[PDB]
Amino acid sequence: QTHAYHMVNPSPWPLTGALSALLMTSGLTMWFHFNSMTLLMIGLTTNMLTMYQWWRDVIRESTFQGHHTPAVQKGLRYGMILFIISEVLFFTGFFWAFYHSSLAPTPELGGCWPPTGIHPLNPLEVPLLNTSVLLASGVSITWAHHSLMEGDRKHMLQALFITITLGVYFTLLQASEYYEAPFTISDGVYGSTFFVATGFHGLHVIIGSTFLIVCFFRQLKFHFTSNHHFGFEAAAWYWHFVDVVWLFLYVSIYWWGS
Amino acid sequence: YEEGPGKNIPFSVENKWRLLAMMTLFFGSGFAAPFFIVRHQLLK
Amino acid sequence: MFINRWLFSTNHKDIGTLYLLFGAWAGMVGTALSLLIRAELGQPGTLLGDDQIYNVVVTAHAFVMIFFMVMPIMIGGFGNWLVPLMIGAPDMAFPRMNNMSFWLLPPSFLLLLASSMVEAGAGTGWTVYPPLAGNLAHAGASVDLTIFSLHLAGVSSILGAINFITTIINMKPPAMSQYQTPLFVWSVMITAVLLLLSLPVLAAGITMLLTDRNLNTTFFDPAGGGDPILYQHLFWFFGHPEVYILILPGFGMISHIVTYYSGKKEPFGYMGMVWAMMSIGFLGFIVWAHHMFTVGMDVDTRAYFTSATMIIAIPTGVKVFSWLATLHGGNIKWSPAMMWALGFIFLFTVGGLTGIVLANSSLDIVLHDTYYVVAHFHYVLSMGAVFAIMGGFVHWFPLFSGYTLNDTWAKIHFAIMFVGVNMTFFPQHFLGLSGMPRRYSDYPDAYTMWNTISSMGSFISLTAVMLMVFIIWEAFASKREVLTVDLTTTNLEWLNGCPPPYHTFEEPTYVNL
Amino acid sequence: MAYPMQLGFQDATSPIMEELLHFHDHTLMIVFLISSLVLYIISLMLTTKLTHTSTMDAQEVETIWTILPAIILILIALPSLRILYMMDEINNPSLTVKTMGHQWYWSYEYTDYEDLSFDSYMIPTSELKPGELRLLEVDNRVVLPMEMTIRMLVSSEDVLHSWAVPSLGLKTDAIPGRLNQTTLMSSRPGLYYGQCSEICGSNHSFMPIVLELVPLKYFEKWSASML
Amino acid sequence: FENRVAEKQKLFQEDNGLPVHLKGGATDNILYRVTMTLCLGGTLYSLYCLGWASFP
Amino acid sequence: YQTAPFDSRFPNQNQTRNCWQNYLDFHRCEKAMTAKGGDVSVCEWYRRVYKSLCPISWVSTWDDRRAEGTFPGKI
Amino acid sequence: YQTAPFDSRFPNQNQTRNCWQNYLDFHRCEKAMTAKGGDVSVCEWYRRVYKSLCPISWVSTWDDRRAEGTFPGKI
Amino acid sequence: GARTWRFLTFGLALPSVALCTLNSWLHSGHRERPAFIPYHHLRIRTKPFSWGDGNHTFFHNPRVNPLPTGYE
Amino acid sequence: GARTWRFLTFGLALPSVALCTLNSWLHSGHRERPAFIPYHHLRIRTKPFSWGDGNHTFFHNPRVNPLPTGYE
Ligand code: HEA
Ligand code: HEA
Ligand SMILES: CCCCC/C=C/C/C=C/C/C=C/C/C=C\CCCC(=O)O[C@H](COC(=O)CCCCCCCCCCCCCCCCC)COP(=O)(O)OCCN
Ligand SMILES: CCCCC/C=C\C/C=C/C/C=C\C/C=C\CCCC(=O)O[C@H](COC(=O)CCCCCCCCCCCCCCCCC)COP(=O)(O)OCCN
Ligand SMILES: CCCCCC/C=C/CCCCCCCCCC(=O)O[C@H](COC(=O)CCCCCCCCCCCCCCC)COP(=O)(O)OC[C@@H](O)CO
Ligand SMILES: CCCCCC/C=C\CCCCCCCCCC(=O)O[C@H](COC(=O)CCCCCCCCCCCCCCC)COP(=O)(O)OC[C@@H](O)CO
Ligand SMILES: CCCCCCCCCCO[C@@H]1O[C@H](CO)[C@@H](O[C@H]2O[C@H](CO)[C@@H](O)[C@H](O)[C@H]2O)[C@H](O)[C@H]1O
Ligand SMILES: C[C@H](CCC(=O)O)[C@H]1CC[C@H]2[C@@H]3[C@H](O)C[C@@H]4C[C@H](O)CC[C@]4(C)[C@H]3C[C@H](O)[C@]12C
Ligand code: CUA
Ligand SMILES: [O-][O-]
Ligand SMILES: [Cu+2]
Ligand SMILES: [Mg+2]
Ligand code: NA
């Protein structure tokens, strides 16, 4: 070749990923209807195996084999931005459901929001702490980015460790919140919107935290250069996305919706 | 990998009658499936 | 070697071939379902059973034709084959992710065929509105399997959109601006932006339906303070963009076919065509509630959605007039592909115009949920999208295969299909105006003559589908190997021969400033 | 009702359906004209040995192609929106009737004074009286006064339905938890037929609507007889 | 820790004809066979479950 | 009284809140008149309007819930 | 009756809306009772509360504005 | 620079977290649970949950989450 | 590039202005003025205005702006 683009070796992971999607969906069906978790646990296992081997191969192709020329890196930048946009539009649907329900409360609710019998969480207690936690993690991940660009291994690792710690703290606070909440997912449209929107957000926090932990271990193994570290950039963009979705949840559901 | 006409496909065109059999099974299976699903639902 | 090449592909051409094979198979399924619909309606009375079995067939017909036939052929098939060749790129940006877009579709299709085999199927309409699609009126796994089918199809198209946008922005020759890319490439980029923004909203909505069915949420259940009409908003926020997704790549193929067979180097008013496609893509996001004129929205809302919907006629008319101006002064080659494209221009215009009729909320009160809507969308889908697919197929078959079709057979095929679709759908205008509802297994006696004629048309279309399979067999059976094609100076996809080598543009094109 | 070999709308029974007929005639003239012009221009492009294959300037013609359609759209939208606002105009109804959709029949409530309610089921084909219409007759018709403004309220006690009467220009979705309003005014006595217009399961094809329009005096006798 | 990237660059650039998913050695083969066995086996199991669920 | 007149508070096709408001207004008024021992004929307008507009099954469900102590509106 | 009890609708130092709401409630009730020709004595609780809480000059100004046709609250 | 972002991390962001942690750990005592009222818009059961006895939410807390029939 | 921002100017931005200009043109025409009511929170006069007779606002429109004493 006399172009800078990456011709990828034939790979089984697209097929194992597609089949993991079949096993997870057929598995959810078999769990909801036929009282069995077997297919679902196979599908979850093959999904994690697929993601592990696929992203391992991308590390092999880039850090170890040198296939990520500037043109390849530019493509991955577009790919990650477009992925984040699709995730923004997914959340938009849940915000639309929330505003629909809350702005026009039906007679079944008492014609009011919050509904009769719903005792919202105090937005000034754990939800405010969770807000300080994710905002603080946006500061620490920025410190990590600058440390990496300045060639500072120790301070990049410290800043990234602090970012991960804050992501874990948010997750444990939210788990505790969920258990303490006097309302459930079955408490009408209030519970439905609360748990499905914050629940998909919590999943993204766990995904984002996992991505940061991958970057931490890659940094420990010296994969990143001071100039070439797209996995770290992508994880940071994803992490800022997760923060911003939280700020919208906090203002919309916890504060305005209380 | 083999290149050129009749070589860039996951089916053989080496023999036109074997091909006719494969194409018949391929398009015929797809066309038949809804008739057999309807039969399946009616037999419940 | 066979498994490495066809199951583990990282090649844009082989993946395009898998998508064309998949879509051709899906088209046979969708055709069979269309014939069962028209067999039920072909004489007054009941043929199969009550509205449940009938609407399981109608629902599956729509999902198969949209998600498994049109989108895989146009975007996965022609898109993967032609886009990299038309920009001199060595493959797609994400050649391995591309393979997963493909392999998600057989599992998606399996989930839909499982929906129809368990319990009494999903007799919901392709819109899957609650509460009929909820866990009381559709108890059991069918609707959940439909939802999961749509999740897998959704992920396939979202990843494919990311791939096409990245490839088209990042992998052109450095001298080539976006305003030097072919219209088919523009049509795929814009379609991919519509998919990226619309499918996640559908995914949110059908996820809420899943949780209402299985986790005791009440998004759409008034008992919990939910609203069935919220589902409709979320569905149609996707569903209107979805019909522009179905036609835009078709517009791109038509621009290439009309230019090619008019003997022109270029389509008329290139920047107007780009403007028109971007305008249609944008307007397509602000019109969705024209699917909801009878649900009880405010009059000012209905006035807005009437007005915004009608605006789409302006950019659309620029494309139609630009295709006519491309023919203008041509040395016309009356190829089978040109016949499909000329049929497209006329029949798409008719269906577009019945769309403008329906845009009027006041008249829509009487036309909504009638066969007038069915007539509108089959002119634009079974005559627009399908004619663009058939024209593209007969034009590019020799590029993909290295073999020529028999042009006389392909003309016979066009003639049969033209009669069949017009006999099928033209009389459905009368059925609609006279008040025949959608999703009916049987009709009052007055509607017999036009249902009889419509059903006879569907059989003529079946005869064309059968002939098409023969015609493809005859080309592979006879092995007439392509030597040359004309107009390669303005049709780069042909310049590596027929078929092009597995790897093309290993040495990129030279383009200076 | 529809008659055999019908091409167009059922004869208008309400002033708003008359308005819609005139509006459709206007819009269909434009559809025919544009369809015909495009077919004619295709034939004109295809019927000459004369050629011009060099680059053509598009700017001048695209003014015509955007302005003329924009004018045509305004000429459709003006009468369209006039009728839209007419069908929303404040009127003072003299009667309110409710209909509730069910799988698979309609119930009617006349609760202005008395608590009158009843169910309205399709007459099976095997039970039709000679000369009665397959899939369209019901046991209990919606008795209403003619030449009077009536408020119909529509809801459902299960899944979506839609309450339609084409000859009166009416189609209002029946949504559980929601009370949708339309206005009904018949210019004539008689029987006016419609059919459920939202997919609602097994018997969606088989839950029709029949209005029986009678002079007020007969409506009052019928109401009094229901006590 | 010490920077051992050069030694991984040498392994993954060895001219041995292996595709990148197998180039780490025998452990790659084991993990591949585990993954594909679970995917193909699970898919066969899902078809069985369909056959069962398609009848009362 | 023939039927509920046009109400500029509820001018649109969705009349749900019209039925709800008149049902609440009737029962709030009837509680106030019973509370001082006043007279429920004062509440008659609200009674006619909600009886006219509200589905029988809505009135019957709301009535049952008021008796159960599960009515979610404030009376 | 000694004075206006605590009202959980108005738990803060700013009691302006408490005076206002009770003044509105009294005059709305009085209109409802005078209209059907019922008994204004059912309105007594609102009267006692607004007289307890509301400055004399506020009540006097509001009464003048109702007589003038310039009172901006809905009665 | 890295120095500035570290200064913000330790001088502003973590102090904020510490203050919100103190605020939370001062309002952390159990609220008094409200009388059970069997409202028809709450404790929704259209299908049994796919775990336990079908009637307990996934993160059911006996102290504050009543069943359809009331507190356990 | 300039080319793209000109395309947006003529292809999206000015068409939007043309459409909103049409919208405004159609909904123009004098709405009927409401009954004068001498509300004490309106037509405030704590000090004469420093122009005209002290009692007319700066862009006083006799058709729709009553004085404290009503329409002129
Ligand atoms: C692309 C979309 C599409 C296509 C092509 C069609 C094609 C057809 N449809 Fe349609 N149909 C829908 C989408 C489509 N349909 C949708 C969305 C609904 C509404 C569902 C609902 O109400 O919920 C619907 C509903 C619908 C109804 C109304 C059902 C009712 O309300 O009760 C009827 C009635 O006749 C009908 C009939 C047909 C017929 C006879 C064809 C025939 O014209 C088909 C003939 C065959 C073909 C056109 C060829 C197909 C194959 C290919 C193109 C592959 C070619 C191969 C290669 C290129 C290799 N369909
Ligand atoms: C490819 C698919 C496709 C395309 C491109 C379109 C294009 C359009 N559609 Fe359609 N539509 C469907 C597929 C499509 N539609 C489907 C599947 C449904 C049913 C969904 C369901 O309920 O299942 C549907 C339903 C639907 C409805 C809802 C009706 C109802 O359910 O009651 C409406 C309402 O406005 C609508 C309008 C339009 C309009 C205005 C266009 C415009 O984009 C058309 C513009 C084109 C032209 C106008 C012709 C070319 C222009 C000229 C030659 C210039 C001059 C013209 C004028 C001056 C008018 N369509
Ligand atoms: C702690 C931080 C956040 C943790 C996140 C959640 C943990 C477990 C599950 C993870 C997946 C989350 C995604 C969102 C899905 C739905 C519900 C999750 C929210 C949650 O955890 O909500 C809980 C309920 O969970 C339930 O029902 C059980 C949920 C388990 C089964 C859910 C199955 C549904 C899966 C839907 C998949 C759709 C995927 C879409 C892909 C789109 C592609 C186009 C709330 O507990 P509760 O007792 O009602 O109230 C508390 C009372 N003390
Ligand atoms: C199209 C908009 C352009 C605005 C031009 C109009 C007038 C002059 C200058 C305006 C400057 C902007 C704000 C100043 C305050 C008030 C004017 C507000 C805008 C206006 O023009 O308001 C008009 C009133 O103008 C009046 O009183 C006019 C009063 C004129 C005297 C202005 C007093 C200046 C105030 C001092 C400025 C202080 C600056 C602070 C600097 C900060 C430094 C730290 C409205 O007319 P009307 O008849 O009441 O109602 C319409 C009925 N048909
Ligand atoms: C256990 C917890 C349960 C939860 C399970 C669900 C999934 C969790 C997954 C967490 C994601 C981990 C992603 C790891 C990616 C590692 C590979 C990587 O980062 O690859 C980098 C490229 O980026 C790239 O492909 C970018 C690749 C971006 C991937 C984006 C990931 C977001 C994934 C979302 C998953 C779906 C969520 C949807 C929910 C509805 C490699 O290039 P560089 O970094 O420049 O290095 C090269 C230099 O060394 C040269 O000097
Ligand atoms: C109800 C349950 C249904 C769930 C269905 C789940 C569906 C499928 C199972 C998912 C299996 C995923 C396995 C990992 C996929 C990784 C893709 C990836 O990371 O793709 C990358 C490109 O996309 C990019 O960057 C940026 C994009 C990264 C996308 C990551 C994949 C996410 C998959 C879920 C999508 C969620 C959609 C959310 C929006 C609604 C790399 O592209 P390749 O072509 O590989 O290599 C190119 C070489 O140059 C690299 O060296
Ligand atoms: C490498 C690919 C992997 C191969 C696939 C492995 C196949 C697993 C075989 C076991 O199958 C299971 O059998 C269980 C019992 O034998 C079922 O229990 C369920 O069904 C029981 C029926 O007795 C009920 O008690 C309960 O619903 C529940 O325990 C369960 O559904 C089912 O999965
Ligand atoms: C061992 C390594 C030395 C740098 C190098 O390998 O050259 C140092 C540098 C940064 C250190 C990490 C960071 O200081 C952040 C964390 C601090 C915690 O107290 C221990 C774990 C923690 C995650 C540290 C582990 C270990 O001591 C690290 C990883
Ligand atoms: Cu009731 Cu359709
Ligand atoms: O959707 O038209
Ligand atoms: Cu639409
Ligand atoms: Mg409808
Ligand atoms: Na039938």
Side-chain angles (χ1 to χ4, degrees), chain A residues 210-223:
Chain A
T210 301
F211 200 176
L212 293 172
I213 290 160
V214 174
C215 298
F216 182 85
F217 279 108
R218 291 189 66 208
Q219 171 63 9
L220 276 179
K221 288 159 189 319
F222 297 82
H223 290 190

PDB file of all heavy atoms in Angstrom, chain A residues 210-223:
ATOM      1  N   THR A 210     -14.837   1.540  33.713  1.00  0.00           N
ATOM      2  CA  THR A 210     -14.131   0.365  33.147  1.00  0.00           C
ATOM      3  C   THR A 210     -13.146   0.847  32.078  1.00  0.00           C
ATOM      4  O   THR A 210     -11.992   0.433  32.109  1.00  0.00           O
ATOM      5  CB  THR A 210     -15.113  -0.687  32.607  1.00  0.00           C
ATOM      6  OG1 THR A 210     -15.936  -1.089  33.698  1.00  0.00           O
ATOM      7  CG2 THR A 210     -14.374  -1.867  32.010  1.00  0.00           C
ATOM      8  N   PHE A 211     -13.588   1.743  31.185  1.00  0.00           N
ATOM      9  CA  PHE A 211     -12.703   2.310  30.150  1.00  0.00           C
ATOM     10  C   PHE A 211     -11.501   3.013  30.820  1.00  0.00           C
ATOM     11  O   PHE A 211     -10.340   2.819  30.418  1.00  0.00           O
ATOM     12  CB  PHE A 211     -13.511   3.258  29.280  1.00  0.00           C
ATOM     13  CG  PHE A 211     -12.941   3.561  27.930  1.00  0.00           C
ATOM     14  CD1 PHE A 211     -13.678   4.362  27.060  1.00  0.00           C
ATOM     15  CD2 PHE A 211     -11.695   3.103  27.529  1.00  0.00           C
ATOM     16  CE1 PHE A 211     -13.178   4.702  25.811  1.00  0.00           C
ATOM     17  CE2 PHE A 211     -11.206   3.452  26.271  1.00  0.00           C
ATOM     18  CZ  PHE A 211     -11.954   4.233  25.422  1.00  0.00           C
ATOM     19  N   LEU A 212     -11.747   3.835  31.829  1.00  0.00           N
ATOM     20  CA  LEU A 212     -10.644   4.539  32.536  1.00  0.00           C
ATOM     21  C   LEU A 212      -9.697   3.513  33.157  1.00  0.00           C
ATOM     22  O   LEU A 212      -8.452   3.759  33.144  1.00  0.00           O
ATOM     23  CB  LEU A 212     -11.201   5.464  33.607  1.00  0.00           C
ATOM     24  CG  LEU A 212     -12.003   6.660  33.082  1.00  0.00           C
ATOM     25  CD1 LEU A 212     -12.681   7.407  34.220  1.00  0.00           C
ATOM     26  CD2 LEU A 212     -11.107   7.566  32.303  1.00  0.00           C
ATOM     27  N   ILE A 213     -10.238   2.419  33.701  1.00  0.00           N
ATOM     28  CA  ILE A 213      -9.367   1.369  34.334  1.00  0.00           C
ATOM     29  C   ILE A 213      -8.493   0.705  33.247  1.00  0.00           C
ATOM     30  O   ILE A 213      -7.262   0.481  33.465  1.00  0.00           O
ATOM     31  CB  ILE A 213     -10.217   0.370  35.129  1.00  0.00           C
ATOM     32  CG1 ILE A 213     -10.802   1.016  36.381  1.00  0.00           C
ATOM     33  CG2 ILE A 213      -9.428  -0.891  35.462  1.00  0.00           C
ATOM     34  CD1 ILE A 213     -12.000   0.280  36.939  1.00  0.00           C
ATOM     35  N   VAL A 214      -9.064   0.445  32.070  1.00  0.00           N
ATOM     36  CA  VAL A 214      -8.261  -0.046  30.917  1.00  0.00           C
ATOM     37  C   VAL A 214      -7.139   0.961  30.664  1.00  0.00           C
ATOM     38  O   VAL A 214      -5.966   0.516  30.593  1.00  0.00           O
ATOM     39  CB  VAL A 214      -9.122  -0.292  29.673  1.00  0.00           C
ATOM     40  CG1 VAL A 214      -8.247  -0.659  28.492  1.00  0.00           C
ATOM     41  CG2 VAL A 214     -10.160  -1.378  29.953  1.00  0.00           C
ATOM     42  N   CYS A 215      -7.457   2.263  30.568  1.00  0.00           N
ATOM     43  CA  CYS A 215      -6.402   3.272  30.304  1.00  0.00           C
ATOM     44  C   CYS A 215      -5.359   3.236  31.433  1.00  0.00           C
ATOM     45  O   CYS A 215      -4.189   3.404  31.141  1.00  0.00           O
ATOM     46  CB  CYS A 215      -6.969   4.663  30.124  1.00  0.00           C
ATOM     47  SG  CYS A 215      -8.086   4.786  28.691  1.00  0.00           S
ATOM     48  N   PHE A 216      -5.767   3.043  32.687  1.00  0.00           N
ATOM     49  CA  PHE A 216      -4.833   3.035  33.839  1.00  0.00           C
ATOM     50  C   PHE A 216      -3.807   1.909  33.650  1.00  0.00           C
ATOM     51  O   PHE A 216      -2.582   2.097  33.809  1.00  0.00           O
ATOM     52  CB  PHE A 216      -5.618   2.891  35.142  1.00  0.00           C
ATOM     53  CG  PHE A 216      -4.753   2.920  36.355  1.00  0.00           C
ATOM     54  CD1 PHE A 216      -4.386   4.120  36.932  1.00  0.00           C
ATOM     55  CD2 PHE A 216      -4.296   1.733  36.912  1.00  0.00           C
ATOM     56  CE1 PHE A 216      -3.597   4.144  38.077  1.00  0.00           C
ATOM     57  CE2 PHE A 216      -3.504   1.754  38.045  1.00  0.00           C
ATOM     58  CZ  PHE A 216      -3.160   2.959  38.625  1.00  0.00           C
ATOM     59  N   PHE A 217      -4.294   0.716  33.343  1.00  0.00           N
ATOM     60  CA  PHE A 217      -3.405  -0.457  33.155  1.00  0.00           C
ATOM     61  C   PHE A 217      -2.552  -0.259  31.906  1.00  0.00           C
ATOM     62  O   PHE A 217      -1.360  -0.558  31.924  1.00  0.00           O
ATOM     63  CB  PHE A 217      -4.233  -1.734  33.204  1.00  0.00           C
ATOM     64  CG  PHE A 217      -4.519  -2.143  34.632  1.00  0.00           C
ATOM     65  CD1 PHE A 217      -5.783  -2.018  35.174  1.00  0.00           C
ATOM     66  CD2 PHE A 217      -3.490  -2.586  35.451  1.00  0.00           C
ATOM     67  CE1 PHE A 217      -6.035  -2.388  36.491  1.00  0.00           C
ATOM     68  CE2 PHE A 217      -3.733  -2.941  36.771  1.00  0.00           C
ATOM     69  CZ  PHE A 217      -5.010  -2.846  37.289  1.00  0.00           C
ATOM     70  N   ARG A 218      -3.104   0.292  30.832  1.00  0.00           N
ATOM     71  CA  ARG A 218      -2.258   0.560  29.641  1.00  0.00           C
ATOM     72  C   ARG A 218      -1.155   1.566  30.007  1.00  0.00           C
ATOM     73  O   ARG A 218      -0.010   1.417  29.530  1.00  0.00           O
ATOM     74  CB  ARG A 218      -3.128   1.040  28.493  1.00  0.00           C
ATOM     75  CG  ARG A 218      -4.038  -0.046  27.934  1.00  0.00           C
ATOM     76  CD  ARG A 218      -4.725   0.417  26.658  1.00  0.00           C
ATOM     77  NE  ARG A 218      -3.740   0.611  25.609  1.00  0.00           N
ATOM     78  CZ  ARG A 218      -3.857   1.458  24.592  1.00  0.00           C
ATOM     79  NH1 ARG A 218      -4.932   2.235  24.473  1.00  0.00           N
ATOM     80  NH2 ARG A 218      -2.870   1.543  23.713  1.00  0.00           N
ATOM     81  N   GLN A 219      -1.480   2.579  30.801  1.00  0.00           N
ATOM     82  CA  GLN A 219      -0.489   3.590  31.228  1.00  0.00           C
ATOM     83  C   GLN A 219       0.560   2.904  32.101  1.00  0.00           C
ATOM     84  O   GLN A 219       1.743   3.202  31.936  1.00  0.00           O
ATOM     85  CB  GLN A 219      -1.162   4.747  31.973  1.00  0.00           C
ATOM     86  CG  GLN A 219      -0.180   5.706  32.629  1.00  0.00           C
ATOM     87  CD  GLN A 219       0.730   6.423  31.671  1.00  0.00           C
ATOM     88  OE1 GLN A 219       0.555   6.344  30.459  1.00  0.00           O
ATOM     89  NE2 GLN A 219       1.649   7.217  32.232  1.00  0.00           N
ATOM     90  N   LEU A 220       0.142   2.037  33.022  1.00  0.00           N
ATOM     91  CA  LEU A 220       1.116   1.311  33.881  1.00  0.00           C
ATOM     92  C   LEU A 220       2.112   0.550  32.981  1.00  0.00           C
ATOM     93  O   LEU A 220       3.280   0.488  33.350  1.00  0.00           O
ATOM     94  CB  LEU A 220       0.422   0.297  34.786  1.00  0.00           C
ATOM     95  CG  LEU A 220      -0.138   0.815  36.085  1.00  0.00           C
ATOM     96  CD1 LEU A 220      -0.821  -0.351  36.820  1.00  0.00           C
ATOM     97  CD2 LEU A 220       0.962   1.484  36.943  1.00  0.00           C
ATOM     98  N   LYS A 221       1.646  -0.011  31.857  1.00  0.00           N
ATOM     99  CA  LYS A 221       2.456  -0.809  30.883  1.00  0.00           C
ATOM    100  C   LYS A 221       3.115   0.067  29.785  1.00  0.00           C
ATOM    101  O   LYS A 221       3.716  -0.495  28.840  1.00  0.00           O
ATOM    102  CB  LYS A 221       1.563  -1.917  30.325  1.00  0.00           C
ATOM    103  CG  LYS A 221       1.257  -3.024  31.321  1.00  0.00           C
ATOM    104  CD  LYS A 221       0.027  -3.806  30.939  1.00  0.00           C
ATOM    105  CE  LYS A 221      -0.427  -4.760  32.026  1.00  0.00           C
ATOM    106  NZ  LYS A 221       0.731  -5.442  32.665  1.00  0.00           N
ATOM    107  N   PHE A 222       3.091   1.391  29.934  1.00  0.00           N
ATOM    108  CA  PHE A 222       3.818   2.388  29.099  1.00  0.00           C
ATOM    109  C   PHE A 222       3.253   2.435  27.666  1.00  0.00           C
ATOM    110  O   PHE A 222       3.975   2.865  26.783  1.00  0.00           O
ATOM    111  CB  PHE A 222       5.335   2.143  29.092  1.00  0.00           C
ATOM    112  CG  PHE A 222       6.042   2.273  30.431  1.00  0.00           C
ATOM    113  CD1 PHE A 222       6.042   1.218  31.344  1.00  0.00           C
ATOM    114  CD2 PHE A 222       6.749   3.420  30.772  1.00  0.00           C
ATOM    115  CE1 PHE A 222       6.691   1.330  32.567  1.00  0.00           C
ATOM    116  CE2 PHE A 222       7.418   3.529  31.997  1.00  0.00           C
ATOM    117  CZ  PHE A 222       7.394   2.483  32.884  1.00  0.00           C
ATOM    118  N   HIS A 223       1.993   2.065  27.423  1.00  0.00           N
ATOM    119  CA  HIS A 223       1.448   2.034  26.038  1.00  0.00           C
ATOM    120  C   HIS A 223       1.369   3.441  25.452  1.00  0.00           C
ATOM    121  O   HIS A 223       1.605   3.609  24.246  1.00  0.00           O
ATOM    122  CB  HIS A 223       0.056   1.416  25.978  1.00  0.00           C
ATOM    123  CG  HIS A 223       0.034  -0.043  26.238  1.00  0.00           C
ATOM    124  ND1 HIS A 223      -1.093  -0.770  26.032  1.00  0.00           N
ATOM    125  CD2 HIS A 223       1.007  -0.887  26.664  1.00  0.00           C
ATOM    126  CE1 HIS A 223      -0.829  -2.030  26.353  1.00  0.00           C
ATOM    127  NE2 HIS A 223       0.458  -2.136  26.751  1.00  0.00           N
TER     128      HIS A 223
END
